[PDB]
């Protein structure tokens, strides 16, 4: 378990990524990097994980990503890919297995249009912790409602189990991490006027890849309390 | 020339797109939609243009794009694609001709990483007209400097004529429209500590596709003055 402890300030930069593997620089509670990890798991890609201490970053980490953000992929050839959506798509193209994005140009364009429908949700999750009372919480539940009703329409129009069709695909993995945190953020009743989106959540937790990666509510709260204090230990909560 | 006049509020929705063509809903001074038009021209795609009056939109236009934004593509099958970058990539995949994005997953990922380096520039252009004096203009030239130095690094690292290699490609077309407006916005000296980016601009204006689409500074100022008054005529400046 200790093997997953994060690298921070003072740590030695890492050696090369071995042939036959790809490396992901990540952080165990980071929903942006969960995306890439979902994709790695669904496609069966052999990989290694380096958790980055995002409150106490290694200086050499900016050599990996000048923005200082996880996730970052690094392969045996020494190529560096960052930005979550870009990492996920790189993996879908570069590796064999289940294709998560469709081949059809239009179908693929739809998945991205849907991604765009969702694009306000991550910064609402952010600003969810600018909320300090029952009033700001009310308003916030509303902002989440207006965005979830956009996704509800897509499911209503298509009448498919998942956003990309009847099978799970990239779009679902790209959005899942923020819905995973909804329960523990006390926002699960924002889906009660979106009955298909609510059924989508339940189908997601049944996906073997989702399920293998889900963080318990308990673990997530531990992380959150420490995150909100700029604690250098947040990243390693539980160890 | 009158053929290019915009459709506004009151206009009849359009008929179907004919077979052998794709339609772009656009606006002649919209840099987001210029992207899609650059791509249409570079790939030699037969198409028709409907200019949308963005200060006085047709109601039926929201049926084309629930966000109400140009550009939107509509094909003969009746499929609808919006968001500029998504339109451009759809076109690159769906149509024959010069491939604007590379086949290599990593090379393609780089183009998108560069796109991401540029992603603050469009809203700086926006906020460029929140500038009302020589002080806010000073600060603004600085904000533009910090972003252009990021692109300068990419050119320094690669030592290529264009951002995607020695040939012009998608990334260049995706960023060009905001650099096109820089002169007329009185920001051309923001490139004077980025000598490669400045040489990139000159090479761009030599590209036959760029050149066929460039709006004169004169035409652009006409548009801007009317835009800044919420004039329903802005869109059709010159006719
Ligand atoms: C890694 C990652 O995705 N982020 C985005 C965090 C968005 N907010 C949250 O997840 C919430 F408040 F916890 F709900 C990220 C960026 C930086 C850190 N950090 O510990 O400094 C964590 C997560
Ligand atoms: C169509 C398009 O790209 N936009 C973005 C405008 C960004 N600002 C500018 O170009 C500048 F101020 F002119 F420099 C867009 C959106 C809406 C309209 N409109 O006329 O309402 C025009 C352009």
Numbering used by the authors:
A (entry chain A), B (entry chain A): 3 to 241
From the paper:
The Omega class GSTs are distinct from the other GST classes because of their active site cysteine residue and their capacity to catalyse several redox reactions that are not catalysed by most other GST isoenzymes. GSTO1-1 catalyses the deglutathionylation of protein thiols and could therefore play a significant role in modulating the glutathionylation of intracellular proteins that participate in specific signaling pathways. Thus, in the models of inflammation that we have investigated, we have consistently observed a phenotype similar to that of TLR4 deficient or MyD88 deficient mice, strongly confirming the view that GSTO1-1 makes a significant contribution to pro-inflammatory signaling via the TLR4 pathway. Overall these studies indicate that GSTO1-1 plays a pro-inflammatory role in the innate immune system and our identification of the mechanism of action of a small molecule inhibitor and demonstration of its capacity to ameliorate LPS mediated inflammatory shock in mice validates GSTO1-1 as a new target and paves the way for the further development of novel anti-inflammatory drugs.
